[PDB]
Amino acid sequence: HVGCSVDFSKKETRCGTGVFVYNDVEAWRDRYKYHPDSPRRLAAAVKQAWEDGICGISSVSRMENIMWRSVEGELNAILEENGVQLTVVVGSVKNPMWRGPQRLPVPVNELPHGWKAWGKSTNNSFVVDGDTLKECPLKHRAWNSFLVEDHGFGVFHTSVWLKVREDYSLECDPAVIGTAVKGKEAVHSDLGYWIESEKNDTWRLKRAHLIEMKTCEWPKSHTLWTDGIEESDLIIPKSLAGPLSHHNTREGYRTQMKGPWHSEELEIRFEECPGTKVHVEETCGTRGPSLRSTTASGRVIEEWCCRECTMPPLSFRAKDGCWYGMEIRPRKEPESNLVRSMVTA
Amino acid sequence: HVGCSVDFSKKETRCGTGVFVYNDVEAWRDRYKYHPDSPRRLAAAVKQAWEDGICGISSVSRMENIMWRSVEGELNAILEENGVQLTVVVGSVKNPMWRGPQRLPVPNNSFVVDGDTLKECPLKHRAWNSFLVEDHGFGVFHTSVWLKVREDYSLECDPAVIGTAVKGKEAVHSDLGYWIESEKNDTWRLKRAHLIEMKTCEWPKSHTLWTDGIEESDLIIPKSLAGPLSHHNTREGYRTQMKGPWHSEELEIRFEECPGTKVHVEETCGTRGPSLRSTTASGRVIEEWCCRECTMPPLSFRAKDGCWYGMEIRPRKEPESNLVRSMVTA
Amino acid sequence: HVGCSVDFSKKETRCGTGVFVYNDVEAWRDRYKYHPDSPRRLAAAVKQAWEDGICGISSVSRMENIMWRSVEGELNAILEENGVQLTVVVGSVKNPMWRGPQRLPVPVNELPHGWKAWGKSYFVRAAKTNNSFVVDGDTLKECPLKHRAWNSFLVEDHGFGVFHTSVWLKVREDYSLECDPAVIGTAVKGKEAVHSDLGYWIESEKNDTWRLKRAHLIEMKTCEWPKSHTLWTDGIEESDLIIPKSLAGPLSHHNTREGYRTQMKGPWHSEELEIRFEECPGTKVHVEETCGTRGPSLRSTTASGRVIEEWCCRECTMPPLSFRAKDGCWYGMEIRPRKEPESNLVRSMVTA
Amino acid sequence: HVGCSVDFSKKETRCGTGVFVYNDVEAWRDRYKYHPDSPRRLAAAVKQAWEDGICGISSVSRMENIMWRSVEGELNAILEENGVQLTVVVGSVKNPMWRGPQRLPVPNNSFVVDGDTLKECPLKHRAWNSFLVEDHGFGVFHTSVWLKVREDYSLECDPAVIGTAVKGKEAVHSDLGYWIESEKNDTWRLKRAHLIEMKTCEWPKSHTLWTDGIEESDLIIPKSLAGPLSHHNTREGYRTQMKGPWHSEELEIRFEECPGTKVHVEETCGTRGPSLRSTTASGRVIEEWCCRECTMPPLSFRAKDGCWYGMEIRPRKEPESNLVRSMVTA
């Protein structure tokens, strides 16, 4: 592995060997040419899982949604010639993605009918996602059955090779995770997570970027400073793939069990957002659900207080607006005028 | 922050943005020009130490040693001119670099910076780890690295230079003189390590991976040799190399048998002992080796003056007293 | 500009400054982001052009067709916002792509209402309407080639974002016939040379004299190669151009091979070609004085799949000239069947 | 073929496959390795030429002179072994490099190369452009570049090293000694050119852009000085620099007013003639010049010791007798 860095403003570069972790979290998920296993085995595995009573797949990450979207027509065409009465359908992914207590098995016996590769060109559904949490409840859906083998970058497009798991496990995919710390900034990276840290006086969560709200547990072998942490202080809860690291804590503040998790993407930024002012006093309100600054009528709270949390304030830059932490409360007006956060970890 | 990469195993290239942890030990000593905040301030600090009775310094890392070397010919004139006859002496290092039990204060008369000077400055009160390097974050395009004396006492190495990274099944712990690689083969374990020096400062846990559940008796690089307190820093079937080749100046721990030697496996075998060379002082290769519970491939050390073997693997018949044995313990 | 080249057979990389010319001809678009001028001016230009009397567009390249298809809906919404009964419909691209006699005009002023960026993800699509402005799309029946604009767009920048690439465009001020030069890339070094653009890749070689080696073609253009990006333009006569001048073949001596004339007639109705000088497998060509006279290029296999294993030529030098289309392997205009009559083979029905 | 590049003007970055052309004008004394494939055969050619009465050679480039000085040691041994009392004397190359009529044949006492030794015999009795170099194509990795004594006759330069490329609105004509640039400023025009040597071999048309329609008198760089016949090698209003500072060791033709000087346009200015330097030998600068019809900015040469002016630019007030004149022509 060889790579080189460039700083445009100074018009110079440094080249050398090492380990490089990139920011794949931006809008580049699509157009990867996904290959969910050899189609000869995938159909047999799906058939056995279905006939065993395990309906549905709960997407572990938006990459899985994109995959199961792209492979829809190919798998549906394979099924008919394969003689299987099924029709896989997909939909928009929700947030956070809840778990399933089962997984797809290896069928052992691939079927006589099957194409070589994915590049070659009813009323029973293996529903994936979308407005059907009850049709094939979480009580019977599969979850975390993939294990990515390879991820390549071609001359113009990427590729991925995939397979099914042999044993059930709660950890997210480690073959794609990347963690890197250098100097006074550390980053935990993933397919959709970008968590940044810093050292003002002690390690704290500077900012984080999220294009998916998972539920799997961050693998411990790709985490920084795992020991001595209590789950009560994780800015991102352990239950939302939050790292079990002291880099994921903030002084004064504690775990955000109730938060904006119904948004599509989150950028956790710690500073007062437009139209609001903050205060610190012992008599400010108690903790609870996080509340928007922007009211349902568009008016903005001008003065805020915190009971005993340190400034700058806690804020989430969700797409639709600014969300404040659990401790920050209105200074003077009743709290009933705001729409609350309606989730829990 | 912006850059590109090329992979040779697979015919692929890539470009993007992110964090880049470079192998600095391959550009060691040919880059960066260290300098303190103000030499006259370091003059005051060394004068304070000299009047306090502290005999001299011991280099934490070769960066400190070479900053001392570079400024030896420039700071000494200030000391001599300001009415104080006091000259700092910087010599070639010998390894391992032991720890000093005290730190500098905030400000023929030799002030020693380690060497063959035990008679001159005993290790009773030698200074160590008083220096602080202001951290540039990712620290790229910064050849003007600073230095400064810390205002409190800590045993951890400077985080300004440490770089720890993982990308899939390959990991790395690295700083200006270390390069530890780990790999996934049924378990996370050490793959090979490149060491251009011997440290004794502790690796901070803020730059360590998988720290909990650790048993320091199963490490390879002991806690006392800057080994990351991590599961990545272990190898199954062997234990801490407290006794080893640590007197050398360049170590390449590798899991491949030394040239000209092959091992036979049996429990009816010898017992643990010190590290032994793969050959006699005359260069003869000892073909006979043995161990109780090895997990192949075998452990080995490669160095300038011939490869060595670890504690866990013993010779079968040859008397061990003839070869060059261990002479120090970490 | 700075860069480095790699050779994966070794741990070798060489870096330095210079001029770098990448291939980019393998039909990689649909990852690109296209910004044709601006929505408020391009729509006005189309509106004015319609009332000028031109029916549609006969695109000059597949990049242009992809660009137009990627914005048909947005431009339809912009036009409908002003109550204009006009709609863009985009169809598939046939070959050859014939030359148009008209150009789209620059607008006097932008429309009063509309967007200002080609990046909003939400909007309501336009409704059906009779006044259709046809982009190529096999619609040569009701309004023919005589009422179509061709080569009206000039690119001004070709960007490569961190993840996706974008290209900016403008409507050409000056009536011209040459292809867009901002994307053309030409290079020479030693005994290899290349002429390239977004849809062509011509490769030349030095064996005794300079000659055409091969060429990859995902488009059948009709613009004329600008001489400013051409090598050794002097002294050539159009009768010796392997790739016709009418098909954007360079006016160069790099575009010649001894004995072969210009292929005015060929398989041009194919989607793609790879002009290669190598007899198709399982066939032989030999010289004969009594070989037949020139004529349309004929396929190597009949309709029923039967192969022909003998051909003759008059003065051709080996290897023979062949076009590697998708549906078969063709031979050049000079090479003729050995004994079979000309009536039992599929022949090119196009002219250049 | 596979590689990557970066663009600082737009801060873009990309990777892919294609045809690359590099700049090798500055750092090439240690890049590649030019050698003669058969010193014995080349020695045979030298011996036959010396039997033919040829005094020496006139180098076509600094590459040829570098090769000759590198193989002088082998030559002075193999000629002696052959029983020949002959010697080769390489030397510095003065500019321009003049064109000889002879060529070496297929295989007092001295065989000289470039040097201020014309007294020995005129240019009429020297060889010029007798060498052929193996054309590796786009090979950037081949350090081994052969030199084989040419056996045919031609005046054009060797295209093995030439490199010509165009990418949108920027072009370049280059070889191992020239780096000529061009641009589209509403019309194709010369922009700059760095020259480490002044050759006299014709630029092949096979590697030239826009070869038709040009007239020799319109070339900024004279056709004799290996200037391409391309329209890329023209500036509007400036005709051939038939005379100029061709005697410099290195040049950089730049179209900008020299420091501390300004030029005006007016029909009252004088006519053309030899090139005149911005500053006189006494160090006195001239702040004002005139031009007749040429458009600004002015032609200049950022040479070692001054900033010359083209043929069209003349001093406005002072007579030309005060200044230094370029004493060379082609």
Side-chain angles (χ1 to χ4, degrees):
Chain A
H1 293 62
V2 178
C4 201
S5 291
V6 302
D7 183 5
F8 308 110
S9 301
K10 296 184 181 178
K11 202 167 186 172
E12 64 171 302
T13 79
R14 178 184 176 182
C15 296
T17 46
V19 172
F20 321 122
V21 305
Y22 297 100
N23 179 0
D24 298 323
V25 183
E26 307 302 325
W28 191 45
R29 301 290 84 190
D30 200 8
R31 70 170 62 76
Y32 276 178
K33 290 173 68 68
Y34 291 144
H35 304 158
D37 205 356
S38 302
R40 204 173 179 81
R41 307 178 84 226
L42 192 79
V46 169
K47 171 166 163 57
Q48 186 169 24
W50 172 271
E51 77 190 23
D52 198 35
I54 295 88
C55 165
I57 183 70
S58 183
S59 303
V60 182
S61 161
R62 201 180 292 267
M63 177 179 79
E64 318 320 325
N65 182 268
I66 300 160
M67 180 190 305
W68 288 100
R69 180 71 67 86
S70 88
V71 302
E72 179 187 312
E74 302 308 326
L75 179 48
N76 284 336
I78 291 155
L79 286 167
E80 286 198 339
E81 70 175 343
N82 194 41
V84 190
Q85 294 299 130
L86 266 174
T87 290
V88 301
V89 175
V90 299
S92 299
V93 72
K94 60 179 75 77
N95 47 10
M97 311 177 194
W98 304 113
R99 293 193 185 151
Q102 291 164 286
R103 58 167 279 273
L104 307 177
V106 162
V108 185
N109 186 8
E110 74 290 338
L111 298 170
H113 282 70
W115 306 353
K116 186 61 62 175
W118 292 84
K120 189 262 179 191
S121 66
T122 60
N123 286 267
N124 303 97
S125 186
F126 199 84
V127 187
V128 175
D129 289 331
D131 299 339
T132 53
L133 186 61
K134 59 91 183 174
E135 187 56 27
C136 281
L138 304 170
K139 193 166 60 177
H140 295 144
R141 296 192 181 205
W143 176 85
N144 197 23
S145 179
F146 287 163
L147 180 63
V148 167
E149 277 277 275
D150 200 8
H151 186 187
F153 308 96
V155 177
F156 182 80
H157 51 53
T158 60
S159 176
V160 290
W161 289 48
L162 291 77
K163 72 180 192 295
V164 292
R165 279 188 187 261
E166 181 65 8
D167 191 19
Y168 195 62
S169 183
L170 268 59
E171 288 198 331
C172 319
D173 197 344
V176 293
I177 277 168
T179 284
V181 58
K182 175 59 168 57
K184 72 182 180 80
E185 287 202 357
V187 69
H188 296 70
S189 183
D190 203 336
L191 289 168
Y193 274 28
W194 187 262
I195 290 161
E196 298 192 314
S197 76
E198 71 182 340
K199 194 183 177 195
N200 187 75
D201 63 354
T202 51
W203 288 103
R204 72 173 192 183
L205 177 70
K206 177 192 182 182
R207 62 173 280 273
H209 191 258
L210 299 176
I211 66 149
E212 58 190 2
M213 301 189 193
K214 297 180 285 211
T215 300
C216 55
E217 313 199 358
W218 193 282
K220 204 179 281 277
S221 50
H222 301 64
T223 301
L224 287 154
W225 187 8
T226 303
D227 79 326
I229 181 61
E230 61 277 18
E231 180 269 342
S232 55
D233 289 332
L234 301 175
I235 306 296
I236 306 166
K238 173 189 171 184
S239 309
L240 278 73
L244 189 63
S245 47
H246 281 281
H247 292 251
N248 193 24
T249 67
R250 207 175 182 97
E251 69 156 39
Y253 295 96
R254 62 175 54 227
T255 186
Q256 311 288 325
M257 294 193 294
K258 300 195 173 73
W261 308 129
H262 68 92
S263 306
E264 202 74 51
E265 311 177 358
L266 281 169
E267 179 178 49
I268 302 187
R269 210 195 296 169
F270 286 88
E271 62 190 9
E272 56 262 68
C273 49
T276 77
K277 175 172 164 283
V278 288
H279 188 265
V280 54
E281 63 185 342
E282 187 271 340
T283 57
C284 194
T286 192
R287 69 180 300 97
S290 295
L291 268 56
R292 274 172 50 155
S293 61
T294 66
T295 62
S297 178
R299 194 257 298 169
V300 176
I301 302 294
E302 199 75 44
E303 285 268 21
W304 297 78
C305 58
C306 187
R307 181 168 285 193
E308 55 184 354
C309 73
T310 299
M311 305 290 97
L314 186 154
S315 82
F316 308 131
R317 299 289 191 272
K319 185 191 76 178
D320 301 349
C322 180
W323 295 73
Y324 282 97
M326 301 171 85
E327 291 76 19
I328 321 307
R329 301 293 93 185
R331 191 73 185 288
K332 65 183 186 303
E333 58 275 14
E335 198 173 52
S336 311
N337 291 281
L338 302 159
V339 178
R340 297 165 291 142
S341 64
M342 307 294 289
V343 294
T344 297
Chain B
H1 195 266
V2 190
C4 292
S5 178
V6 63
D7 302 332
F8 284 114
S9 176
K10 63 186 77 66
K11 321 298 171 187
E12 303 180 0
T13 54
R14 174 67 196 278
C15 293
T17 80
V19 177
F20 294 67
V21 175
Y22 286 114
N23 178 327
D24 289 306
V25 66
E26 290 281 29
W28 66 304
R29 310 306 89 76
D30 285 342
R31 187 174 279 155
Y32 313 112
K33 297 181 293 184
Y34 314 101
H35 71 282
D37 62 329
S38 282
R40 298 184 188 186
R41 297 293 312 295
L42 184 58
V46 68
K47 178 183 172 288
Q48 197 81 16
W50 178 245
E51 75 180 58
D52 282 350
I54 303 304
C55 194
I57 319 301
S58 177
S59 290
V60 180
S61 65
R62 288 186 185 266
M63 164 180 78
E64 198 204 330
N65 174 282
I66 286 166
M67 199 284 290
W68 287 118
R69 203 95 68 83
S70 301
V71 69
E72 188 182 53
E74 307 185 331
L75 171 63
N76 296 340
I78 306 303
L79 274 295
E80 177 182 306
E81 191 271 358
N82 292 117
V84 179
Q85 273 291 345
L86 176 64
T87 57
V88 303
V89 181
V90 189
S92 58
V93 300
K94 192 168 178 68
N95 303 349
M97 303 193 295
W98 300 105
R99 185 186 299 161
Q102 55 81 21
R103 47 150 289 153
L104 262 54
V106 182
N108 301 307
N109 295 341
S110 55
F111 195 83
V112 175
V113 182
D114 192 74
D116 193 11
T117 64
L118 265 292
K119 292 297 192 294
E120 293 177 350
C121 288
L123 186 57
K124 68 185 178 75
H125 291 149
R126 205 79 80 77
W128 169 86
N129 199 36
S130 294
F131 268 121
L132 181 144
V133 175
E134 290 213 331
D135 47 9
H136 308 84
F138 305 134
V140 206
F141 311 113
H142 293 109
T143 54
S144 189
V145 175
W146 295 10
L147 288 92
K148 172 153 49 70
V149 294
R150 201 187 298 95
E151 291 91 338
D152 65 354
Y153 192 54
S154 303
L155 280 69
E156 70 184 37
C157 319
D158 195 340
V161 295
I162 300 171
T164 303
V166 191
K167 192 61 167 173
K169 284 164 65 181
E170 302 279 309
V172 69
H173 308 63
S174 74
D175 63 18
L176 278 164
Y178 272 42
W179 181 263
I180 303 170
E181 296 179 47
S182 305
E183 186 177 2
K184 181 65 178 283
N185 185 263
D186 293 329
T187 46
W188 283 93
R189 68 174 186 184
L190 183 73
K191 177 189 169 196
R192 60 174 288 272
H194 189 63
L195 295 159
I196 297 302
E197 60 187 344
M198 308 300 170
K199 289 167 62 165
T200 301
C201 60
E202 309 285 317
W203 195 293
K205 282 181 171 180
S206 45
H207 304 65
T208 304
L209 293 171
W210 198 0
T211 293
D212 61 318
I214 193 64
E215 296 297 347
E216 65 193 351
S217 63
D218 282 347
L219 296 169
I220 286 292
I221 294 171
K223 183 180 194 296
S224 56
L225 288 176
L229 290 154
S230 175
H231 287 269
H232 289 87
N233 186 23
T234 70
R235 181 179 180 274
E236 182 60 293
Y238 297 148
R239 276 163 43 68
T240 300
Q241 276 70 18
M242 172 50 67
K243 302 170 70 167
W246 304 117
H247 62 281
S248 196
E249 293 185 33
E250 176 190 331
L251 275 296
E252 284 187 54
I253 310 186
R254 211 182 297 179
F255 296 162
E256 294 183 320
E257 77 277 17
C258 274
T261 79
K262 300 292 173 66
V263 194
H264 312 81
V265 58
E266 56 177 324
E267 289 73 21
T268 61
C269 196
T271 191
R272 277 268 285 271
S275 63
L276 306 176
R277 280 180 72 259
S278 188
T279 70
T280 63
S282 55
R284 307 194 304 193
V285 184
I286 297 86
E287 290 281 334
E288 301 177 30
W289 305 87
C290 176
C291 61
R292 306 301 188 105
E293 301 189 323
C294 289
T295 290
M296 291 290 105
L299 187 153
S300 85
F301 303 114
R302 262 75 164 185
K304 172 60 183 292
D305 62 357
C307 74
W308 295 57
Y309 270 99
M311 313 188 306
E312 300 272 19
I313 287 155
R314 315 308 312 171
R316 296 183 83 256
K317 297 203 295 275
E318 190 77 347
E320 295 171 298
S321 305
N322 287 4
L323 275 60
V324 178
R325 293 156 62 265
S326 179
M327 61 155 283
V328 66
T329 185
Chain C
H1 303 295
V2 174
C4 307
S5 69
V6 304
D7 190 8
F8 306 106
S9 301
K10 312 166 72 191
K11 284 192 179 181
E12 299 270 48
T13 63
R14 189 261 192 275
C15 303
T17 67
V19 178
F20 298 78
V21 179
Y22 303 103
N23 184 318
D24 195 18
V25 179
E26 319 180 19
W28 293 338
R29 294 86 184 90
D30 301 345
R31 183 168 172 211
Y32 282 46
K33 194 71 66 174
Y34 291 104
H35 306 291
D37 191 309
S38 57
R40 209 76 77 77
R41 276 166 39 88
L42 172 57
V46 168
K47 177 267 192 181
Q48 177 167 112
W50 177 266
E51 62 179 330
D52 197 24
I54 67 167
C55 181
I57 295 174
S58 178
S59 60
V60 70
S61 66
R62 280 186 172 192
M63 192 274 278
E64 184 167 293
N65 204 50
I66 289 162
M67 180 218 81
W68 273 104
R69 200 187 299 138
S70 82
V71 298
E72 66 181 0
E74 199 165 350
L75 189 153
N76 288 338
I78 293 152
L79 277 163
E80 188 179 87
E81 280 184 45
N82 287 277
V84 187
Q85 287 284 336
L86 188 149
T87 287
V88 170
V89 301
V90 186
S92 54
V93 68
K94 296 162 68 182
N95 292 359
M97 291 181 277
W98 299 114
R99 188 179 293 182
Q102 292 170 291
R103 267 49 153 188
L104 284 176
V106 289
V108 177
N109 58 8
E110 67 196 56
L111 292 182
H113 301 86
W115 293 353
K116 296 300 292 177
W118 306 93
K120 293 219 304 176
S121 192
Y122 160 74
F123 60 105
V124 177
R125 286 186 63 92
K128 185 263 290 187
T129 182
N130 296 352
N131 301 104
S132 185
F133 174 89
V134 300
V135 180
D136 53 3
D138 192 40
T139 315
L140 286 150
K141 289 145 285 192
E142 51 258 58
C143 63
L145 177 73
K146 226 72 178 179
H147 303 148
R148 294 183 181 277
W150 169 86
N151 195 7
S152 293
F153 280 82
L154 177 81
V155 302
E156 64 171 358
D157 208 353
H158 187 59
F160 289 80
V162 180
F163 309 106
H164 58 79
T165 69
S166 59
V167 188
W168 291 269
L169 284 74
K170 294 191 301 212
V171 174
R172 201 190 280 275
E173 284 266 19
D174 55 322
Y175 182 94
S176 187
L177 282 152
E178 72 185 21
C179 320
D180 189 343
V183 291
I184 290 175
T186 294
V188 191
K189 192 158 187 169
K191 64 90 175 179
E192 286 287 339
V194 65
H195 294 87
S196 73
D197 62 21
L198 292 180
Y200 273 27
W201 182 264
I202 297 168
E203 203 161 83
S204 305
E205 173 182 51
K206 181 80 156 73
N207 189 359
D208 196 359
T209 67
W210 284 88
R211 65 185 196 189
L212 180 70
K213 192 169 74 86
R214 68 180 285 268
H216 191 222
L217 294 174
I218 68 163
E219 294 170 335
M220 308 291 164
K221 292 189 292 185
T222 318
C223 57
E224 307 201 345
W225 205 274
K227 299 207 305 287
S228 54
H229 296 55
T230 305
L231 297 145
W232 191 9
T233 63
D234 73 332
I236 185 58
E237 57 188 310
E238 301 177 5
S239 61
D240 290 332
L241 292 172
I242 301 285
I243 310 168
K245 191 187 183 191
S246 307
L247 277 72
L251 182 72
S252 169
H253 281 280
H254 291 250
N255 188 12
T256 75
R257 200 164 180 135
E258 294 193 318
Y260 289 105
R261 55 158 49 77
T262 185
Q263 278 80 36
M264 291 289 105
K265 308 180 185 173
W268 308 125
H269 62 298
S270 306
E271 293 289 329
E272 307 178 13
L273 299 173
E274 182 177 2
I275 300 190
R276 204 162 77 229
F277 292 101
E278 180 185 32
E279 61 202 33
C280 318
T283 317
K284 69 93 174 181
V285 188
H286 283 156
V287 292
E288 291 191 37
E289 183 175 356
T290 60
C291 191
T293 304
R294 311 292 73 70
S297 64
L298 308 180
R299 198 168 61 188
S300 70
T301 69
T302 60
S304 57
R306 203 187 85 256
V307 180
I308 298 91
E309 75 294 327
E310 304 192 306
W311 307 69
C312 63
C313 80
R314 287 271 268 271
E315 296 190 327
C316 76
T317 190
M318 291 289 106
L321 179 155
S322 64
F323 312 128
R324 250 66 166 186
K326 181 174 66 166
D327 70 336
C329 192
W330 303 69
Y331 291 165
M333 203 168 68
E334 292 84 5
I335 287 148
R336 312 302 300 163
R338 183 50 181 75
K339 52 192 177 291
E340 276 82 349
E342 306 295 328
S343 60
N344 199 9
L345 292 166
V346 70
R347 80 198 83 167
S348 294
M349 297 294 190
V350 298
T351 64
Chain D
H1 289 161
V2 191
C4 306
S5 65
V6 65
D7 178 7
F8 301 109
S9 76
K10 292 183 286 176
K11 309 190 170 66
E12 308 299 331
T13 301
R14 72 164 293 179
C15 291
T17 187
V19 168
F20 296 178
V21 175
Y22 287 89
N23 169 19
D24 289 329
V25 68
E26 305 98 354
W28 75 277
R29 272 74 174 209
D30 63 351
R31 188 70 70 178
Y32 315 112
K33 178 46 55 183
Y34 308 95
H35 68 78
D37 73 346
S38 50
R40 286 183 173 276
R41 296 175 60 264
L42 178 63
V46 163
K47 180 181 183 282
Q48 287 194 24
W50 171 249
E51 290 172 17
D52 201 32
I54 286 163
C55 316
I57 305 94
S58 174
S59 308
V60 179
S61 63
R62 288 194 195 269
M63 173 196 78
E64 169 161 7
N65 191 23
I66 287 161
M67 178 223 74
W68 282 107
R69 70 174 65 174
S70 300
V71 302
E72 174 269 334
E74 174 163 43
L75 281 161
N76 289 284
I78 65 181
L79 277 296
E80 208 280 323
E81 189 273 328
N82 287 117
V84 191
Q85 304 303 325
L86 184 65
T87 55
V88 71
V89 178
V90 300
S92 60
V93 60
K94 63 205 299 290
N95 299 114
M97 302 173 186
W98 297 115
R99 182 183 288 186
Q102 309 297 340
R103 284 97 174 93
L104 293 174
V106 61
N108 201 31
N109 63 6
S110 179
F111 214 82
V112 295
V113 191
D114 288 271
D116 197 17
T117 71
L118 279 72
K119 178 266 293 182
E120 61 93 3
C121 81
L123 186 70
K124 284 166 58 180
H125 301 315
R126 293 181 171 226
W128 174 82
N129 197 15
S130 296
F131 274 57
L132 182 148
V133 184
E134 185 67 26
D135 54 358
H136 293 323
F138 303 125
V140 299
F141 304 104
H142 296 82
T143 53
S144 181
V145 186
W146 311 2
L147 288 94
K148 308 177 75 85
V149 180
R150 186 194 283 277
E151 318 296 12
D152 60 18
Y153 186 95
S154 68
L155 286 85
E156 300 189 326
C157 301
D158 193 329
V161 295
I162 291 174
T164 294
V166 190
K167 189 64 173 170
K169 59 179 283 281
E170 296 284 311
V172 68
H173 293 66
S174 71
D175 66 24
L176 288 162
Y178 284 19
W179 179 261
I180 296 162
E181 296 182 37
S182 308
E183 74 180 325
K184 174 67 185 291
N185 169 50
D186 114 91
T187 171
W188 283 96
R189 63 181 71 221
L190 180 67
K191 185 168 69 79
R192 74 181 287 263
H194 186 84
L195 301 177
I196 57 151
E197 57 186 23
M198 267 66 79
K199 304 195 287 291
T200 308
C201 60
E202 312 289 322
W203 190 284
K205 279 188 173 177
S206 311
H207 301 53
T208 297
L209 296 147
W210 201 319
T211 299
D212 67 304
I214 192 58
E215 179 199 39
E216 178 173 316
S217 64
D218 302 339
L219 304 176
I220 307 308
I221 302 177
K223 198 186 83 186
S224 184
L225 271 289
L229 285 80
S230 51
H231 281 73
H232 293 263
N233 186 30
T234 69
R235 192 94 188 191
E236 193 61 35
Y238 300 93
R239 291 202 298 127
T240 304
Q241 304 302 288
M242 199 79 260
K243 307 181 187 178
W246 303 135
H247 71 280
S248 307
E249 299 182 333
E250 301 186 327
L251 290 180
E252 172 176 66
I253 285 158
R254 212 197 294 181
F255 289 76
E256 292 187 321
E257 290 176 300
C258 300
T261 295
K262 187 170 175 66
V263 192
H264 296 75
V265 64
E266 55 177 290
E267 182 268 343
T268 77
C269 195
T271 188
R272 273 173 52 114
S275 184
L276 262 51
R277 198 169 70 189
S278 171
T279 54
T280 318
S282 59
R284 185 172 67 90
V285 175
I286 303 192
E287 298 89 343
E288 303 304 322
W289 302 67
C290 60
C291 190
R292 186 168 286 198
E293 189 163 34
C294 75
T295 187
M296 302 307 111
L299 199 159
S300 55
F301 305 78
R302 297 297 186 288
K304 287 289 202 79
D305 63 10
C307 187
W308 300 73
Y309 293 98
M311 305 295 92
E312 288 68 36
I313 317 304
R314 295 289 84 167
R316 191 163 76 240
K317 55 182 290 287
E318 298 298 327
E320 294 171 272
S321 312
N322 290 269
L323 300 99
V324 186
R325 292 163 69 267
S326 64
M327 305 295 291
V328 71
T329 183

